[PDB]
Amino acid sequence: QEGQRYQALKAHAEEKLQLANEEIAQVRSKAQAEALALQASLRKEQMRIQSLEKTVEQKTKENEELTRICDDLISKMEKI
Amino acid sequence: TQEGQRYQALKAHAEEKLQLANEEIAQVRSKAQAEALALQASLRKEQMRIQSLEKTVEQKTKENEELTRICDDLISKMEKI
Numbered sequence A: 001q002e003g004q005r006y007q008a009l010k011a012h013a014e015e016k017l018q019l020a021n022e023e024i025a026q027v028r029s030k031a032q033a034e035a036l037a038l039q040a041s042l043r044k045e046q047m048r049i050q051s052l053e054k055t056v057e058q059k060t061k062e063n064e065e066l067t068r069i070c071d072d073l074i075s076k077m078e079k080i
Numbered sequence B: 001t002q003e004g005q006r007y008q009a010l011k012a013h014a015e016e017k018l019q020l021a022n023e024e025i026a027q028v029r030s031k032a033q034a035e036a037l038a039l040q041a042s043l044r045k046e047q048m049r050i051q052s053l054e055k056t057v058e059q060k061t062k063e064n065e066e067l068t069r070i071c072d073d074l075i076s077k078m079e080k081i
Helices: A003-078 B002-078
Strands: none
């Protein structure tokens, strides 16, 4: 087929390419950005959990120590 | 026509190069959306997990407050009086 025909669809075809390549650049950037921001939020939650998980074992410890001390007191009072 | 044969291969070249580009866009945004759901669901799980832990903390905090106050009350009675 014709060549004047060709350069015709050619200049167009370069355009469709030149837009897919751009959005290729976009969707890769997006994906990484969305990856980063989300794996950061997670490890931030997971840490508050172990923060909270171990704030809890310490309230438990405090409950046991409070009971230890105040029951020790009670006993010595009964034994005066 | 050898001309026809030449230009048809040239268009096939440009066509395929576009298709691979279009494929790449699709795979990437396919995998992006998939990973984004698996974690943000996992995120939700942790946010819930945190709600329950925060209830537990405020629960035990009150228990220890009540326990400290009646002990303090006992101690005070023996101090000065």
